[PDB]
Each structure stands twice: as C-alpha cells, then as structure tokens.
Design a protein around this nucleic acid. Structure first.
Ligand SMILES: [Zn+2]
Ligand SMILES: [Zn+2]
Lengths: 56, 56
DNA sequence: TTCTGATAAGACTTATCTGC
DNA sequence: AAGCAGATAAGTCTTATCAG
C-alpha cells in the first residue's frame, strides 16, 4: 500500500508490489503485469476484490 | 457450427456446443457457462480468437 | 526503499463428457 | 441422430513472489 497512490488502471489501492505504466504512473502489480504481456490496459472487469496468498 | 446463429454475447460463431441464455437466445459454450457461474454476461474483452483442444 | 524482470502457484475459464 | 443443461476436469492465464 501507500498514501496518495491509486492504481492508474484498476484503481485499487492495495497491491503487494507497485509498478509503473509506460508513462511513469503508478499501477498495482496485477495491472503493471497484465499490460507488459498484453500491451493493452488491464480490462478492469477482472478486477478482483481481495488478494490471494500463495505458496512455494 | 450452425447456419443463422451467432453468440448473443461474444458474437462468435464457432463454439463446440451451443447453450441458451436465460432468454432462450443462443450463446457459445464459453458464454453460456460464464453466465451460469457469474450470473452476469461474459466480459467480451476476454473473447478469444480460436478454440483450444483438450485431453483426458 | 522502489521498481523491472523472470518464475512459477493455482485460480478461473471453458472444453469435454454425460444424462435428458 | 440432435439440441441442451449440469458436472467434472485441463491447461490457459493471472498475478502473487522471488531476485537484481
Ligand atoms: Zn490495477
Ligand atoms: Zn459468447
């Protein structure tokens, strides 16, 4: 998280790690990634509510 | 396939098996399913091009 | 502490397989 | 044969984690 920063795309404000869009504008991990792979914004419709944990 | 039938949601016209929306209107397998689980239309943005095969 | 990449967990989509 | 509704999985894709 962080105070004063919102996802420039999914607009969420709680994302493990923040990244930057190809415009220097803050984006939540999901988004940041999704764009790097689809070179198109992140269809906000798959905007999930909470965040999942994971395992190694 | 089938002549004269288009996906009432994803508009595709090639879907393994056709289903019906809760309005009796033809829908391609993906859609038909996605709605039964999300009780909301199928975000067309995840409209895939071709169709994948699978294995058992 | 910040942020970009690479890796890979396993959540979701949706093709199949059945039973009407 | 045909058309459709439900269940059950199958990898595909999304995306939390791990490094640099
Ligand atoms: Zn976002
Ligand atoms: Zn459809």
């Amino acid at each position: 998280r962080r105070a004063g920063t919102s996802c420039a795309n999914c607009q969420t404000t709680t994302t493990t790690l923040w990244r930057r869009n190809a415009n220097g504008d803050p984006v939540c991990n999901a988004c940041g990634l999704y764009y790097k792979l689809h070179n198109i914004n992140r269809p906000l419709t798959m905007k999930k509510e909470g965040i999942q944990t994971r395992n190694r």
